[PDB]
Design a protein around this ligand. Sequence first.
Ligand SMILES: [Mg+2]
Ligand SMILES: [Zn+2]
Lengths: 92, 687, 56, 582, 27, 83, 237, 225
Amino acid sequence: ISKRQRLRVFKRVLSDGDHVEVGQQLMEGSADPHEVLRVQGPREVQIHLVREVQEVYRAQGVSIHDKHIEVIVRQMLRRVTIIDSGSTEFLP
Amino acid sequence: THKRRLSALGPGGLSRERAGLEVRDVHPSHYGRMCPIETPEGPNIGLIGSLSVYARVNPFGFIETPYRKVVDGVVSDEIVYLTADEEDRHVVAQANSPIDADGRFVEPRVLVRRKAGEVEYVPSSEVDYMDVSPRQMVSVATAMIPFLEHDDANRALMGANMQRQAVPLVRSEAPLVGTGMELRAAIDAGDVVVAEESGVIEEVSADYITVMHDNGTRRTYRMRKFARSNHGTCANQCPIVDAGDRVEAGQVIADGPCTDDGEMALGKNLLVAIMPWEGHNYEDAIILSNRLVEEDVLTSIHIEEHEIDARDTKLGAEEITRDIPNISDEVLADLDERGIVRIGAEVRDGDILVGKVTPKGETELTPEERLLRAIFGEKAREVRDTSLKVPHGESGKVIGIRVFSREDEDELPAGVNELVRVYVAQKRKISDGDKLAGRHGNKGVIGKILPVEDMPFLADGTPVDIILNTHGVPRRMNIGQILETHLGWCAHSGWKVDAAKGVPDWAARLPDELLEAQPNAIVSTPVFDGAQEAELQGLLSCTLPNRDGDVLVDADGKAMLFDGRSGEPFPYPVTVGYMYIMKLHHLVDDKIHARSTGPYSMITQQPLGGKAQFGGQRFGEMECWAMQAYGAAYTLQELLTIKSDDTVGRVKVYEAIVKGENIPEPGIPESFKVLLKELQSLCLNVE
Amino acid sequence: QETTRVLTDAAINCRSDKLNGLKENVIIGKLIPAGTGINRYRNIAVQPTEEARAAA
Amino acid sequence: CGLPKLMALELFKPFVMKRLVDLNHAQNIKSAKRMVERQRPQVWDVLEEVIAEHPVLLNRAPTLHRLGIQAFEPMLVEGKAIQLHPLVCEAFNADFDGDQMAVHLPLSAEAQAEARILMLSSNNILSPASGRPLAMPRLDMVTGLYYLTTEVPGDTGEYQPASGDHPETGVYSSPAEAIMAADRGVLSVRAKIKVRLTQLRPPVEIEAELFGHSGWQPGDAWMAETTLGRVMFNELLPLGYPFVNKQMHKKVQAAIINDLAERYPMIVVAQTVDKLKDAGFYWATRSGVTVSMADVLVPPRKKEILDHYEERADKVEKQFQRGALNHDERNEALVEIWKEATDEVGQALREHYPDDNPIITIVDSGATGNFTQTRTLAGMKGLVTNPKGEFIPRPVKSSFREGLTVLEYFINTHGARKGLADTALRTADSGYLTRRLVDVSQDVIVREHDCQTERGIVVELAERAPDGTLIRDPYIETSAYARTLGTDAVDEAGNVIVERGQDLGDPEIDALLAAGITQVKVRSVLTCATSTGVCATCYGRSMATGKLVDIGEAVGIVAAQSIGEPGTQLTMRTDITGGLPR
Amino acid sequence: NSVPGAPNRVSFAKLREPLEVPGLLDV
Amino acid sequence: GGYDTPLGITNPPIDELLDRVSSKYALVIYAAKRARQINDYYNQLGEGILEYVGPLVEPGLQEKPLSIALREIHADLLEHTEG
Amino acid sequence: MLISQRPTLSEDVLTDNRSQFVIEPLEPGFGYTLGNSLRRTLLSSIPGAAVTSIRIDGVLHEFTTVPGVKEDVTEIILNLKSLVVSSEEDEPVTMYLRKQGPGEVTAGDIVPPAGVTVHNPGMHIATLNDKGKLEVELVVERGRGYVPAVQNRASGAEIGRIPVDSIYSPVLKVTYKVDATRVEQRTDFDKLILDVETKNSISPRDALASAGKTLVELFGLARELNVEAEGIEIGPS
Amino acid sequence: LISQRPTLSEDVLTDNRSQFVIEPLEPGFGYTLGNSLRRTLLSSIPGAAVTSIRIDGVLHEFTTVPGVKEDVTEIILNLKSLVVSSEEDEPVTMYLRKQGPGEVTAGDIVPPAGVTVHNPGMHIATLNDKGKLEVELVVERGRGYVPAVQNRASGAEIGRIPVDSIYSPVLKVTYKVDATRVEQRTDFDKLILDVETKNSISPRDALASAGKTLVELFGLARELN
Ligand SMILES: [Mg+2]
Ligand SMILES: [Zn+2]
């Protein structure tokens, strides 16, 4: 964690020994969507992806309704991976 | 400006995909070596620029720039040409620094440019170089914009680009307000006949001038009456000396295409008002009076050529002749005896220029054709007619027929027998749709040509000529057009500064013989050192009347127009003045196109492309996305099957339209069949 | 995108298209399954009503 | 739409061939085709008959989104230019600087009905992205309506309640008498009068005050202290609309067209928009918005402000010269000082101007522009960026009215050329992103009417104030409007306020906020339980119509176009990406 | 000035310049 | 229903049309198949009469068949069933 | 010379007295000339008669309201201001109205002297109550156009007589626009569309005929300089 | 009620411009009256102009005659400033012949009967010893402005050069009103019309023809009744 990165500020900046939650962002910047799916399940990864795209488009004062963004997010999270073959034709 | 052009790309240079973002920037070592304004504005921005005014190329290929050397705070007049490294070694002062008329600086703190492009103030002992002039950092065509120091950079870029696309009119009047760079940039472009050696004029006409030199000899200069340029514009050269005058070595002796009395002239001076008028001048549209169509103010001559060649073939030799088969005697009236047209025949689209016939060969006939030829008794006429017809949407006279031959021993290419070129010329007026522009990047097509009487006039009865729009000025930061309008009105009416009790406070730094000027006088504000705003106010206050005692324009620069249509005066005073606009080469007659059914492609069976052929428009990917996003599917099936590729579908659509039946249901496209055959030929079984 | 690398392993697995999406009907030139192309709207019977039939 | 006859004669050639064969102007198709080619003077008289009631499509390239192709009714127009309506320019994104537009033509009855019903120009008023109207009054119409509906205190012929000498001399019997007294030089359009109105519906307060319940207007009478201009404006709006009585800013016109298109049929909205364009242009000419360099005023205390900030800049430069701080700290100190000076000069310039200056009227009426451009016109240009993106501590102190100098112009050209190249590069990148999204989301179409699921996401919806109220969340129009309630909404073990499966427009949102609930479980296309493509109640209300979405819509391509359309306008910044590559 | 057939075009230029413009096709 | 008198293409008002059908795509195929029926009536008029039925409402001077179809729809003179 | 296409005048009556007139096809440009000239001549050139000054007992300086009646002074004033009346005497005549007892005074309560006609007696004017009595003297004279409130230059000639505006014009609201008939065959001819709405005093076609009658005299003024000067003639009817 | 009628008097300033004053009008009338008279005066006064020229040595417009300084397009642009008043509606022809040195003026045109040229001091072209100019011109009536009627629609030869024509004898027309607006409400206007004609017809005749056309067109409203 490089010294060019700064700590996350919430409610004050992060201290030592501070009790943090499950999906709390430790540093300051952009969280990885692959990890936030693994930690918080597929529900929060819909919330974080919809809010982060809207936070870019509303900076220029452009309004897109969220049902236009939820369509693309639904097409992303279709498939699952295979970690056990079972006994039916599915490669790990 | 097509010469003196620097391009970063080409053979041995980077392409436009290898062109990074860093190479398109303006490095601070461009001051005086390359213009930061003048560049194309498409995808090639920053890769192509032009040289500056005083710049000079090194022996090694670097770009040198002059500088006045100053020794111990005493500005000398020795001039040292300096490249970029030596320009970094020293420090270099400003152009319009207050010299004390001795070589000394007025203030001890002068603006300066440091090594890495830093801009600092400095005590005046350290300064060892000074610029030669303002407008050193700028190009040729950008130094012809008046009031450049008030505009932005993007609209100045658009003005410098659109200044060179002006067309030559028939009259070509010099601009009222300009810079000093018209005379030099016109006599140095070589398109003006310049007397090589001094003497006296013997003989003038519209073709040739013979001066008489000081020692016996004479010299004929031949003009160019209506030569065709490289893009279809006229190239007239009329003389401007009379039969008794005395010319000196270097005097302008004949105008060029876009010149008037030597200097450049790209358009006309037109009265303008800056009100928005009934939504016709809405969102960069320009309305005009009918006086410009009537008095031929804006009218260019365009000259095109058509070329055909009689050559040999397998079956015989094609001949240029009057006897064209299956043709009437109505179209054979304008043709003369050897097949080509006469000189002066006004032609329309689809008429015969050169009557050429090919040996057809042997073909079998349909029985209906056979019995129709038996019914009317007409013969076979075994040679096929392929003439040169003037293409779609063209007209005008026929100027000149330059016809080569083989028998007269001309250098013709191998296998050709007779070459012939016909020159058609038309006289285009102005029209709604044509693109007009000023000198500050305020472009805009012509919205509606009003008649003369429904055009808002002054309190004198003088109608305005064009009407610009208000909302396009303040959001584009190009109020140089408003300053040029004010100073143009001052230069048209003429002024007289009343120095009865002393020269007034605004004009204390004006030159002499600018305290008063005649009407229709010319002035010249240079680029970065010109007419101040306070001097503009002072000139606009004292603005001597027209014919009566009538000051039509008050001190604000505005006038009280009357509505030419309703009748009542407009309730607020409106800015008027004399602007300078040019007619660009974006006319409508080179853009309007249509197609019902024309030619088709070779490998695939789509229609062809472009106005040069007949061609149809491109219904690309994103428009298919829009048609899908509507839910409209039947129109997509139409446009993708029975207008482009259904080879048995097109003729059924045409027959159904002509007979008046419903359109049949479409079929598969031939482009898909070609896809299938290529996939089968790549060893891929596609069933 | 990547027309070669899609096509070469599609031919290995003997993958058979079903013409069910939206881009393939645009390619082969049949009527797309969206908007006025679906079976609910493409198979509408249109006839005059019986009362207006008798009045002519 | 306009159409040149020299182009429509080539578009409609077989139709006109059949028609002039049918009228015995030619013996057969061959002489008819030669008659078209020679352009004989009866083919125009046939061309009008074969043109009338036949829609054509008008393309504009590039086609960013769904409203880039609309279908018009042609009519024959002289000349050679495709005449366009001045309200579809915003949807087409076309100015008149020489832009070309391609015209297509449907043939069969199915495609003719598709262009007559689906893609007609008077049926697409709203936008599919956000649901705001895109046939709203633009530049000159906005300035005209703002001048027509503003009110000047103390104009010619106001209402002064008098005593002793005379009565008030401000009232009128009817707007016809008001128009006669304004045609004579007594009344100005923008003075506060008291007319008596009969065919304009009063607002809610005066309706419940005078008439109570049955305030049907067209024979009733009531007095109204307004101008003449707002009466003339409210005559444009339909009969059922209440009397507005405001000052028509662009946002007020947006709200008016939004309400009028949510509550009324579409043809009323189209005719209202047409009338508004007419009155806006006609009063835009008479407004007197002109630019002259005497109308660009400069602040009077510019030199004192520049000298006071120059002294502090001299102090920072002297401290850097004395070695007390390095190069970067003095650069940051100079950047801060001159940013503060730029804001100060902008403040003094803002307070110096009057309200009826053409520049400040064009800005503050929402027609075009913003105050930074006026600050750079008169005032101070400010700090200019670098080729790298830093801030040069020189900054330009000259306005574009006083004229810049040589080095300041050369400093400005860096940022100008940088922005101009970045625009084209970003436009190509946004085109690639839209091309990716359309291909990905292409198989999401509506298939059923109701998936009958019970899942659904939640919505924050006006979070609780700490003092204790319901402060409204700012983004409710883009996160909770036009959706369907997945569950019920109840509070305090009381009655349900909005039930399961409602459209959830503005009155129900106001009912929820007034009844004091905050979180609702809404139904959306992330949890739609259909097999292939979404259902219809999960997608909710469509933005372009206002009703429920249909059972054949291509909502995937609509969503991909609405996301990837405005990517050109996305700025960027001077180690997290904050624009289009984010 | 210094071109023998020049039209008298009066200038608003405040400051003299030492060097005239070189020949523009010299490169 | 307090609009002005319409003209041209939009002479049957679209909001008065869309109360007869479910959605706009059904209205499109409705009017298009009625127009195909009407044009097939006109072309087979010179020969023997078939089951195709003519324009029920009185046509214009020279009207397109699709406008006759739309006015027959707006006059509530047809009936249709989906698929 | 000849016009080469004779224009015509045709009406299309909307209400009892609100008609629109369409004049077609005029050669290009003339539509705006004759349209705005006809509009100004409709408004400010047809003579009529209207109320000029009223006076009512109980009013000396309290200009707010009077006792006995419900609606105040200003509502009675703008009820009397739109009261259609014709006359025959250019000198100012007076009219009297008086009513006691509660009820509704209408325009039929008034009594016209010899030479004035009231054209809508069933216009509600006031509402008497509490057995009040109203006694208002009117001053009716005839004029043209629309004069504003003529100021009381005489200070104390009549303490009760307060003046009003006077809608002398028999029409109220005239609007117009042009159009673009037949651009291709005969090069963009114009089509004027008038729209006149009057009182019930005279019909719109009679108003337009009287305006044409005075306008042709006003231009026959300019005609009577050189009578044999060639201009465009339309020809026969 | 004003029971007085307006009159129209005259005011000469120079030979080809004069002033006309109308009083007393109703208030708000003078602007509309002057604008109607100006909109007719500036457009619909019938005059006469040249229509097509024919020079002997040339065949089209874009050439030059041997000897003269101008080319044929410059002689066209000079001849478009001709001021000529015809007499009959049939197109008459006029001639111009000049040989040898000198300057060709517009007074060198010899007119036929009826027509006359009002500006003999207009310079057309110049000549030397090598030059010899010979050109016929066609004079025709009409009104308004009509562009160059093409050679193919007519039945003329190759030598005929069609020229634009502008038939309007009026040059500059304006007005100003004098609203008195007294505070006794007996107010009126006072129009002052200012005609300037281009020496072919008098402003009296221009105003008489404009009044005749207005009396024609405004009689249409009174006629149907
Ligand atoms: Mg554009
Ligand atoms: Zn669902």
